[PDB]
Structure 1
Amino acid sequence: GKDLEVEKALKERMIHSVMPRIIADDLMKQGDEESENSVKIAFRPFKMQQIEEVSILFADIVGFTKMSANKSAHALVGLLNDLFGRFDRLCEETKCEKISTLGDCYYCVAGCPEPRADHAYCCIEMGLGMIRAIEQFCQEKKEMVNMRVGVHTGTVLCGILGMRRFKFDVWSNDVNLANLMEQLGVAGKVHISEATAKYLDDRYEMEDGKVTELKTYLIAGQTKIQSMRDQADWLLRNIIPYHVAEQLKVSQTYSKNHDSGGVIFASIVNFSEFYEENYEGGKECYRVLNELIGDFDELLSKPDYSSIEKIKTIGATYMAASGLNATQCRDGSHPQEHLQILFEFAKEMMRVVDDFNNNMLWFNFKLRVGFNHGPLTAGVIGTTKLLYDIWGDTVNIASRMDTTGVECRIQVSEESYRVLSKMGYEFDYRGTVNVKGKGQMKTYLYPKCTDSG
């Protein structure tokens, strides 16, 4: 009947929760129906604009785990949604497009779709506002967490890559640069670059903040419906998985501890040296990358990978997890057998890139996979801005496993080695890795010395 417009309102909310307002309304002229043919062959289709003169702003909670130590696995999502809701309020106040929340990290761009000339002002002013907001949360809930902020300006190419859990995002050498400069930013004060000071116009309390170890600075102040219900159901199963799609029907928010659960970060090692930006922004390198990520999103659609969830893809990194469909024990099944199938995913996706290396002539991709398992907390972030994501200790431990990983080999965590060892796989002891946040850690790579030795 008329309810079709209701379902179209839902689908419009879904779009507006994965892509900026601008391109959300742009995709609401439905002239080119090639995405409509994505809903329903050589190169997968994707759209990526190479936009110059945009700012990037990252911000990580400082001392996050020290706060998330003993929350109720639900109050954590509560306070975190409060924080990012203040942050979104500030985004609209400051006219700057947020992009996503990488676990603890939160980041935005200053007008990539709709350019601006004051974008540096907009960006770092939002940074200062974020400092204010986290300071007020610090003395409102009484939590000892401030957040380090980093800003870098330049050119970024913004678009969508992937088929499963695709989200408007940004990529460059400048994005990664803002990332590291936040990583080198001392808490509470925005850590900016030469590239944004070169037109900051000194209207702020310029403070040349060296690293304690490219001329970075520091600042601190101064009928026909069935198609439509199909499309909306697909976009929703995109943005959030099935079980949460059920639980959210009846509940305002969502949150769930998972005492056992595995997570893998598959990062392509030698992308940034395959990506030569001399061409038209080199967005064709990102086209090849999207063609790759397509093969992992394809892997997801196998039968036996039902329980696997691609949480998101962070640039070249690919972040997957399991142990989320597991809601009841079965008599003839083993509990932690899911860690096998997820692990097999890892192996398979390794194999996948070798297929992509057959179609990649006189160059090879090399992805390192980091594997961990343990406790974690899954949650859903916003209202009218839906964003499924998981935190905990497995997330960061596996990310720092991968980031300390070796390519073409699966770096596994210790207790994961213990559990997997009985399941037939033969690991080889790597030694000891100094994991930021855990000190020395014992690690086991998967292939039994696949190289010579």
Structure 2
Amino acid sequence: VNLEEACLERCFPQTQRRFRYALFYIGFACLLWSIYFAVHMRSRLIVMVAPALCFLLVCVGFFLFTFTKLYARHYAWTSLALTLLVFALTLAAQFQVDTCLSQVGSFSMCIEVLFLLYTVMHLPLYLSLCLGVAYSVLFETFGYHFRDEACFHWELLSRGLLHGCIHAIGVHLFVMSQVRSRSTFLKVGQSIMHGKDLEVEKALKERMIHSVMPRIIADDKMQQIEEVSILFADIVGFTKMSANKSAHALVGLLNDLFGRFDRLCEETKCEKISTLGDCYYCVAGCPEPRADHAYCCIEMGLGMIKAIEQFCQEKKEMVNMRVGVHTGTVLCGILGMRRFKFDVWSNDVNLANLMEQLGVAGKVHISEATAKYLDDRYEMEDGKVIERLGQSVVADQLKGLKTYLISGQPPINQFSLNFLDQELERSYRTSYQEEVIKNSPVKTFASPTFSSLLDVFLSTTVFLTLSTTCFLKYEPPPPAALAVFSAALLLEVLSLAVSIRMVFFLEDVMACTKRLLEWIAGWLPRHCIGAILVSLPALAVYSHVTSEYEFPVFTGSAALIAVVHYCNFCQLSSWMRSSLATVVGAGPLLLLYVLIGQEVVLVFFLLLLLVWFLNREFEVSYRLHYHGDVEADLHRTKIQSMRDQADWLLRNIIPYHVAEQLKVSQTYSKNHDSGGVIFASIVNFSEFYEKECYRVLNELIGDFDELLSKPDYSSIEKIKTIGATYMAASGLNTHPQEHLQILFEFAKEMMRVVDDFNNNMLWFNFKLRVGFNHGPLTAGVIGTTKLLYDIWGDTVNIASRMDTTGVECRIQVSEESYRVLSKMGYDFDYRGTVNVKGKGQMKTYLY
């Protein structure tokens, strides 16, 4: 009931203006009648024109009531108060009747007041219908009882059918007027709610975009920006933190730790690329060409050491940082269509990663290139990596590069009734045509197809009842009367059958009649049939007139309703209906007469003005209703696009099995008893690389991304891509090791397209080493304002070890995975032993 109040207060300006215009019209009707009463009814003046002028003063008082704040609270009461007064005046004016007035004048007083109460007063259905019928029945009762004999069965039935028509038109007019207003208010409410939901989801999509891309990239496909300082950090001691701590608690610690990193990164105003497990590597100087990149990178790197001690002293941990800095040229951009993220690729990045591996815990490690951009603002210490770690495999490729360490510091025109935007107006014309075309179901009472059904039905019952009274008078009728009525009846039943078939769409329909049914729904053909349909009651009356006219009171009284019937078919243009009513529903009677003559001209002018005005008001109600519909549809198609974009970019960050949980809790955590991770890197790209070469790399990843869309790889969800390496995981959503089999086929299919893609290259084939290991892994979502899904653990780090110790297009596998891979029947070869941290020399078999 609160929304009904909300409907009423929003629609109140319409009701207030509608009531005010009724006040103007009734006073105008009272004034014009008084002038006519003053000239042709001079026999009794003070008893006839004084109520007219007194009621005119009442309208001014009622107009004064409108501005009052009390009227806004009880506008229904004021309309009810006027209704009784206008009822009393018309019945009193009918009470009296060169001293006699024709009834057609009184009938207009009954008709015009009835239309005002039903349509332009916004009173309830039960009150308006009961008051209208009670006023009508008392109008007829007073007329029959108080008739004059000095001047002037089936006759009584004719009066009821005539009054039956106006009430039928009146309730039809008011119900649809109510239906459009309620529908327009609702669709406006949905539109304003859709718009509010659009802003909250447009920001959500931007937040999803910012989770994989920086702000500057999001403004709008690769770059060759040089002089870029690359950070690298490692959580030395995560393996200790890995054991004897719960998964949710574990991801909580890193969420605060990386969140602390994210905050200080914002303080450093640098860019964070991604967090590879415990590693946190971030770039400076790209894509924005910042010149202080080295000094910021040193600052956050030392800040990370400062942050970890604060982090250690808060939740009581024992961990440190191994920071590595190397500046130089770098490549930036996006690879892939799914799980695509901003990343940096160069030999500098690997050396920057290598520098982090050559660092010492709690110390920032820098390159010689970085030292060139560093002044004495910090302390310089010799790197001393050669004697710290000996001549190890990691230290072989330093290639004589000296290194250093750092410790700290309403569009409708009033006249023509058209939409101001011509494109909207054109769509409005074809709306009924396309509504039939799409076969849209009848949703509400304001549907254009349903609206036509009742308009045709109302034109039916009005035409028969109006014609019934005319035939009751004759009970020889002229042949023109029978022929017109039969043709009108023949047209009416076919038009009614068209309306029901346009709504109900019976199974007897075929394509042939559908084409013409759509054809009829067009603007011009509907006006061609509609104008005749509207005029059908009008020609019914004028079919019964002959040369023996000199009969006149009945035809005039019946013609009062034929012009009244013209308010029906609201879908048709109001100007055509209003003009046709003047020319074909009122015109034929006016020149037929050519004081009774002066009275009829005044009577029809008042009715035509009311008919013209009501057609004006209900047309803009219909036009504004369609405006509300198209805006709601326009907002619904804009909310679905944002729905698709936000969901797709959510899939760009987290897989399916994570979206539901993030809808329940702000943090995600899960441990895995058995989990396989795939690492696939490209070697000969460096030989191919010399930005122009990386475009070929992008389509290669896009070809790899097409492997994920295959129905047989729905259990595999990639994690991310770093450099030329592709990281995929199988078993997160979980034969006990069926995920591994799909993962192995993914790696095999991975080189299959690699060899297939090499066929399109000129004298250059690509390379792909794949590592494989399965076991316990922990995953989770990192960040609050920037989401990030990644998996880390012993199996992940050992998986990357297998790519580093990799060979040509050959799937390196661990002993643990070989325990279950060779059982099924996979043909596997042996290679030997490689260096593995945490397990010593590892027995590595191969595909």
**What's the TM-score once normalised by structure 1's chain length?**
0.88
How far 1:290 moved relative to its partner?
1.0
How far 1:406 moved relative to its partner?
1.5
Q: Which residue of 1 aligns with 2:652?
A: 238
How far 1:288 moved relative to its partner?
1.2
How far 1:368 moved relative to its partner?
0.8
How far 1:144 moved relative to its partner?
2.2
Instruction: For residue 133 of structure 1, give the secondary structure of its aligned residue in structure 2.
Output: helix
Q: Which residue of 2 aligns with 1:258?
A: 672
Cα offsets for 1:408-444 (capped at 9, x unmatched): 1101111211101121211112222221332111111
Distance in 1 (alpha carbons) for counterparts of 2:757 and 2:770: 17
Which is bigger in relative contact order (C-alpha 8 A, separation at least 6)? 1
How far 1:84 moved relative to its partner?
0.4
How far 1:24 moved relative to its partner?
2.4
Instruction: For residue 405 of structure 1, give the secondary structure of its aligned residue in structure 2.
Output: coil
Distance in 2 (alpha carbons) for counterparts of 1:335 and 1:142: 39
Q: Which residue of 2 aligns with 1:387?
A: 788
Distance in 1 (alpha carbons) for counterparts of 2:291 and 2:819: 56
Alignment check: 8 A CA contact 2:285 2:291 kept = no
Instruction: For residue 295 of structure 1, give the secondary structure of its aligned residue in structure 2.
Output: helix
Work out which of the residue numbers 89, 97, 106 in structure 1 matches 2:280.
Answer: 106
Distance in 1 (alpha carbons) for counterparts of 2:707 and 2:757: 13
How far 1:185 moved relative to its partner?
1.1
Alignment check: 8 A CA contact 1:267 1:318 kept = yes
The count of residues paired between Structure 1 and Structure 2 equals 412
How far 1:114 moved relative to its partner?
2.1
How far 1:21 moved relative to its partner?
1.9
Cα offsets for 1:374-428 (capped at 9, x unmatched): 1111100011110001112211111112211222110111121110112121111
Distance in 2 (alpha carbons) for counterparts of 1:295 and 1:223: 32
Alignment check: 8 A CA contact 2:682 2:768 kept = yes
Q: Cα RMSD between the aligned structures? A: 3.2
Work out which of the residue numbers 745, 748, 766 in structure 2 matches 1:344.
Answer: 745
Distance in 2 (alpha carbons) for counterparts of 1:72 and 1:290: 39
How far 1:80 moved relative to its partner?
0.5
How far 1:110 moved relative to its partner?
1.6
Larger-Rg structure? 2
How far 1:323 moved relative to its partner?
0.6
How far 1:308 moved relative to its partner?
0.1
How far 1:126 moved relative to its partner?
0.7
Alignment check: 8 A CA contact 2:346 2:723 kept = no
Alignment check: 8 A CA contact 1:159 1:170 kept = yes
How far 1:168 moved relative to its partner?
1.1
Structure 1 stretch 205-214 or stretch 300-309: which is displaced more? 205-214
Runs of 4+ in 1 over 6 A off after TM superposition: none
Alignment check: 8 A CA contact 1:400 1:436 kept = no
How far 1:158 moved relative to its partner?
1.2
**What's the TM-score once normalised by structure 2's chain length?**
0.48
Cα offsets for 1:60-81 (capped at 9, x unmatched): 1112212212221111100001
Distance in 2 (alpha carbons) for counterparts of 1:113 and 1:268: 25
Task: Report 1:16-415 matches (<5 A).
Answer: 16-26=210-220, 47-213=221-387, 214-220=401-407, 223-276=637-690, 284-325=692-733, 334-415=735-816
Distance in 1 (alpha carbons) for counterparts of 2:308 and 2:688: 39
Distance in 1 (alpha carbons) for counterparts of 2:766 and 2:637: 47
Instruction: For residue 315 of structure 2, give the secondary structure of its aligned residue in structure 1.
Output: coil
Cα offsets for 1:229-282 (capped at 9, x unmatched): 1111110111111111010001010000011111110111222222118xxxxx
Instruction: For residue 817 of structure 2, give the secondary structure of its aligned residue in structure 1.
Output: helix
Q: Which residue of 1 aligns with 2:168?
A: none
How far 1:312 moved relative to its partner?
0.5
Instruction: For residue 257 of structure 1, give the secondary structure of its aligned residue in structure 2.
Output: strand
Instruction: For residue 351 of structure 1, give the secondary structure of its aligned residue in structure 2.
Output: helix
How far 1:148 moved relative to its partner?
0.2
How far 1:347 moved relative to its partner?
0.9
Cα offsets for 1:132-153 (capped at 9, x unmatched): 1112222332322211000111
Distance in 2 (alpha carbons) for counterparts of 1:434 and 1:152: 26
Cα offsets for 1:62-106 (capped at 9, x unmatched): 122122122211111000011101101101111111111011110
Cα offsets for 1:26-51 (capped at 9, x unmatched): 4xxxxxxxxxxxxxxxxxxxx11111
Distance in 1 (alpha carbons) for counterparts of 2:758 and 2:245: 45
Gaps of 5+ in 1: 27-46, 278-283, 326-332, 447-453
Instruction: For residue 304 of structure 1, give the secondary structure of its aligned residue in structure 2.
Output: helix
The structure whose residues are more often strand, as a share, is 1
How far 1:177 moved relative to its partner?
1.8
Alignment check: 8 A CA contact 1:99 1:168 kept = yes
How far 1:163 moved relative to its partner?
1.5
How far 1:211 moved relative to its partner?
1.2
The structure whose residues are more often helix, as a share, is 2
Alignment check: 8 A CA contact 2:301 2:364 kept = yes
Alignment check: 8 A CA contact 2:773 2:814 kept = yes
Alignment check: 8 A CA contact 1:401 1:435 kept = no
Distance in 2 (alpha carbons) for counterparts of 1:290 and 1:105: 25
Structure 1 stretch 87-96 or stretch 433-442: which is displaced more? 433-442
Distance in 2 (alpha carbons) for counterparts of 1:336 and 1:53: 47
Work out which of the residue numbers 206, 211, 214 in structure 2 matches 1:12.
Answer: 206
